[PDB]
Amino acid sequence: RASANLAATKMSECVLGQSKRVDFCGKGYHLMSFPQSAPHGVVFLHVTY
Amino acid sequence: PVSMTKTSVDCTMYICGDSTECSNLLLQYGSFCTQLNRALTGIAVEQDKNTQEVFAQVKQIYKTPPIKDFGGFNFSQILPDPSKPSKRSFIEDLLFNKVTKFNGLTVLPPLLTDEMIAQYTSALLAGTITSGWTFGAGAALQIPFAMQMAYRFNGIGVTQNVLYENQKLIANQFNSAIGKIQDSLSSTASALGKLQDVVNQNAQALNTLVKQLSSNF
Amino acid sequence: LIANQFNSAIGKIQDSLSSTASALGKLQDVVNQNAQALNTLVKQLSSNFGAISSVLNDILSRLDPPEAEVQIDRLITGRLQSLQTYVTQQLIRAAEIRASANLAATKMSECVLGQSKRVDFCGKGYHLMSFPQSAPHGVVFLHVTYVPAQEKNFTTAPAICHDGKAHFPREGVFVSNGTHWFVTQRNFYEPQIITTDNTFVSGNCDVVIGIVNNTVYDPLQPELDS
Amino acid sequence: KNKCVNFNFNGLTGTGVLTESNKKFLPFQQFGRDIADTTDAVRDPQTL
Amino acid sequence: SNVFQTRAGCLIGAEHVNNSYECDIPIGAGICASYQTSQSIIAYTMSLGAENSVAYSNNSIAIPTNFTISVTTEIL
Numbered sequence: 001r002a003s004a005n006l007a008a009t010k011m012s013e014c015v016l017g018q019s020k021r022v023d024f025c026g027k028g029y030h031l032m033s034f035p036q037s038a039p040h041g042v043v044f045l046h047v048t049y
Numbered sequence: 050p051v052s053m054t055k056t057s058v059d060c061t062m063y064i065c066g067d068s069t070e071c072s073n074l075l076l077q078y079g080s081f082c083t084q085l086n087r088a089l090t091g092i093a094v095e096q097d098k099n100t101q102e103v104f105a106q107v108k109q110i111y112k113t114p115p116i117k118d119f120g121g122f123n124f125s126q127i128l129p130d131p132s133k134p135s136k137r138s139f140i141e142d143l144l145f146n147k148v149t150k151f152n153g154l155t156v157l158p159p160l161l162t163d164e165m166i167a168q169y170t171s172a173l174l175a176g177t178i179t180s181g182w183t184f185g186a187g188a189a190l191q192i193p194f195a196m197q198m199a200y201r202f203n204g205i206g207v208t209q210n211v212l213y214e215n216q217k218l219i220a221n222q223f224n225s226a227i228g229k230i231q232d233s234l235s236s237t238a239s240a241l242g243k244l245q246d247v248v249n250q251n252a253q254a255l256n257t258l259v260k261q262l263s264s265n266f
Numbered sequence: 267l268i269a270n271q272f273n274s275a276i277g278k279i280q281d282s283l284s285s286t287a288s289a290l291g292k293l294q295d296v297v298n299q300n301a302q303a304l305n306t307l308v309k310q311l312s313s314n315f316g317a318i319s320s321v322l323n324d325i326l327s328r329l330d331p332p333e334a335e336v337q338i339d340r341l342i343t344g345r346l347q348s349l350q351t352y353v354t355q356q357l358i359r360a361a362e363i364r365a366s367a368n369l370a371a372t373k374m375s376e377c378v379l380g381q382s383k384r385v386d387f388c389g390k391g392y393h394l395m396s397f398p399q400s401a402p403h404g405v406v407f408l409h410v411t412y413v414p415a416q417e418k419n420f421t422t423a424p425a426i427c428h429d430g431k432a433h434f435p436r437e438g439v440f441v442s443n444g445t446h447w448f449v450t451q452r453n454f455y456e457p458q459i460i461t462t463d464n465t466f467v468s469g470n471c472d473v474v475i476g477i478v479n480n481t482v483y484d485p486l487q488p489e490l491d492s
Numbered sequence: 493k494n495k496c497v498n499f500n501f502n503g504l505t506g507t508g509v510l511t512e513s514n515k516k517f518l519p520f521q522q523f524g525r526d527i528a529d530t531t532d533a534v535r536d537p538q539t540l
Numbered sequence: 541s542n543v544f545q546t547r548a549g550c551l552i553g554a555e556h557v558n559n560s561y562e563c564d565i566p567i568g569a570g571i572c573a574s575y576q577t578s579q580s581i582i583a584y585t586m587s588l589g590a591e592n593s594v595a596y597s598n599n600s601i602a603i604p605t606n607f608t609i610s611v612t613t614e615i616l
């Protein structure tokens with residue numbers, strides 16, 4: 001549940017917006033993120049500058 | 050990790066399979082069995098809620114247009130591929146191929162099928178590609194992907210002229226990075242190790258539980 | 267207009283809370299999940315656990331200490347296991363409530379005591395402000411947010427050519443209603459004449475993909491010409 | 493009444509404060525129980 | 541007397557309906573039930589939401605011309 005809450009927060013702040021939070025959306029300055037479904041989980045492709 | 054397998058264990062048949070004498074003796078303990086069933090039911094409903102909170106973040110199922118003119122950015126490998134029987138992306142199918150009883154133990158199917166989670170991810174990706182962050186705050190507002198990339202460059206403190214003057218270099222870098230993501234997922238299993246850990250940690254536990262039926266105590 | 271929209275939204279909050287119980291369902295769940303557990307615990311006092319009687323006082327009254335000892339041991343084992351189960355489930359539920367309370371404290375800090383840029387952390391739309399309200403064993407945040415409402419299509423261009431120079435919007439975007447080019451803020455249609463005070467120059471026309479031809483007003487030129 | 497005493501009512505033994513009960517038992521009823529099935533009310537053998 | 545085979549098991553007393561609606565009572569692997577219409581319990585593949593193509597183009601932008609102030613309740 002903690003992991004899924006983190007995943008929901010990353011979907012909200014990282015896919016549905018651009019995050020100023022450092023390293024919340026991977027190495028560098030966050031540009032955007034793309035979600036992908038995985039068996040019992042989520043995979044975020046973080047596009048950063 | 051977002052959810053795990055919704056396992057339910059019938060307390061009565063696990064402890065006292067098809068035995069009336071054993072069930073009558075187990076009745077001497079009271080609500081031991083009912084509260085264990087309640088806890089496992091809570092866990093399963095919680096797994097469904099986890100999946101809903103992560104993926105059902107979009108009110109409408111958005112489409113990418115048939116003409117994929119995204120200023121040179123290539124999303125073909127993350128957008129759904131209609132050729133595959135499951136409408137999953139190339140990368141999603143790479144992800145699904147990397148992650149690998151009868152004693153009152155049942156497995157409840159998740160409320161959202163893999164197809165519906167794929168449709169959620171497709172809708173979120175299409176909204177991001179066609180409207181930027183606008184679909185997250187309200188109605189989806191179409192904007193050219195180059196101008197969205199300029200918005201985001203402004204967001205990270207770089208002027209949009211840097212994007213527009215270096216647009217195709219940036220498109221090529223993004224495409225190469227997606228290709229490297231494919232190459233990393235196609236040759237390294239341990240990449241999805243985290244998800245596999247969950248699938249292991251549940252199964253091991255279940256094994257242990259069934260093995261305890263073979264003990265004398 | 268904005269004051270009236272806020273007042274109407276507060277009225278709708280009242281109407282939603284006055285007619286829908288399930289709205290506060292989450293808090294009720296906690297109040298249920300504790301009480302059920304407590305009920306279960308007390309119900310375990312009525313179980314034999316293999317003893318002759320669930321009532322402890324009915325054992326001592328009917329048996330000699332050597333024989334009462336075995337039945338009391340059975341009752342002790344059963345009631346100890348019941349209490350351990352209760353305490354373990356309460357520790358896990360306390361961990362859940364602590365996570366919820368940490369989230370509530372973070373929302374109070376970042377959402378009531380400030381304006382949050384985090385998307386959907388403070389509800390649907392662009393967060394303007396939040397108001398806290400106490401609730402039985404919990405908190406209720408009224409998130410006031412800005413939702414863009416009436417959308418309109420426009421033609422757009424990344425930049426504009428004036429004299430071989432590429433003009434980019436200082437903030438906002440270039441929008442065409444079909445014949446004329448303006449520069450507007452991104453979140454609200456307020457078209458303005460494209461001037462050198464609205465834009466900045468960077469390089470020339472060749473580099474930018476999708477650049478369009480237009481005139482960029484120079485606010486000085488009419489004054490200087492006189 | 494109104495004092496913490498040890499009581500024995502027709503073999504039901506318990507420690508408690510016995511107060512005048514507004515509960516009106518049906519004539520066949522002898523005891524009363526709570527939602528948790530703990531003894532809540534009793535009937536005096538000597539006087540009803 | 542309706543007997544319908546789902547991936548979640550055997551469902552008896554619910555009429556299978558081809559139409560997709562928002563999930564009301566979650567049954568199982570994409571299947572939800574609801575009381576509708578005369579009144580009856582129906583089972584259906586849950587609808588994920590309104591299907592909408594965004595009018596994307598390389599030179600088309602949609603700009604808001606108004607707004608609404610929304611007060612939403614969060615309970616913790």
Ligand SMILES: *[C@@H]1O[C@H](CO)[C@@H](O[C@@H]2O[C@H](CO)[C@@H](O)[C@H](O)[C@H]2NC(C)=O)[C@H](O)[C@H]1NC(C)=O
Pocket residue numbers: 117123124125126
């Ligand atoms: C996006 O990239 C994919 C490959 O990742 C491109 O598809 C390839 O296209 C070439 C010729 O156009 C073929 O030889 C390859 O076999 C294709 N590969 C795959 C995996 O489909 C696709 O053309 C690119 N998109 C655009 C618009 O150029």
Ligand SMILES: *[C@@H]1O[C@H](CO)[C@@H](O[C@@H]2O[C@H](CO)[C@@H](O)[C@H](O)[C@H]2NC(C)=O)[C@H](O)[C@H]1NC(C)=O
Pocket residue numbers: 443444445446
């Ligand atoms: C786009 O906007 C421009 C500016 O508002 C419009 O041009 C004006 O049109 C009105 C009458 O509709 C005239 O009185 C003004 O003199 C025009 N202004 C200028 C500077 O010429 C234009 O009509 C709009 N076009 C569309 C298709 O809506």
Ligand SMILES: *[C@@H]1O[C@H](CO)[C@@H](O[C@@H]2O[C@H](CO)[C@@H](O)[C@H](O)[C@H]2NC(C)=O)[C@H](O)[C@H]1NC(C)=O
Pocket residue numbers: 427478479
């Ligand atoms: C914008 O204006 C420039 C010049 O003011 C146009 O450039 C001309 O393009 C034509 C067609 O290719 C050439 O024959 C001319 O030699 C060009 N002139 C110059 C000075 O470069 C340009 O085509 C215009 N763009 C649009 C979209 O109308």
Ligand SMILES: *[C@@H]1O[C@H](CO)[C@@H](O[C@@H]2O[C@H](CO)[C@@H](O)[C@H](O)[C@H]2NC(C)=O)[C@H](O)[C@H]1NC(C)=O
Pocket residue numbers: 267270271416605606607608
């Ligand atoms: C923006 O929207 C508001 C309402 O959301 C509009 O105000 C309404 O105007 C109509 C008449 O056109 C009245 O009947 C309503 O009572 C008004 N509502 C409120 C809350 O005042 C407003 O006109 C819109 N503005 C623009 C520029 O579109």
Ligand SMILES: *[C@@H]1O[C@H](CO)[C@@H](O)[C@H](O)[C@H]1NC(C)=O
Pocket residue numbers: 417418419595602
């Ligand atoms: C913009 O144009 C498209 C054309 O397909 C249309 O579907 C859409 O409704 C238009 N948007 C607005 C806000 O009028």
Ligand SMILES: *[C@@H]1O[C@H](CO)[C@@H](O)[C@H](O)[C@H]1NC(C)=O
Pocket residue numbers: 118475476598599
């Ligand atoms: C935009 O797309 C149209 C196709 O409708 C095409 O003719 C035009 O060249 C494109 N413009 C740019 C700048 O890519």
Ligand SMILES: *[C@@H]1O[C@H](CO)[C@@H](O)[C@H](O)[C@H]1NC(C)=O
Pocket residue numbers: 556557558
């Ligand atoms: C749904 O429609 C199809 C025809 O495409 C039909 O074969 C099927 O029986 C229908 N399902 C129900 C439950 O009526």
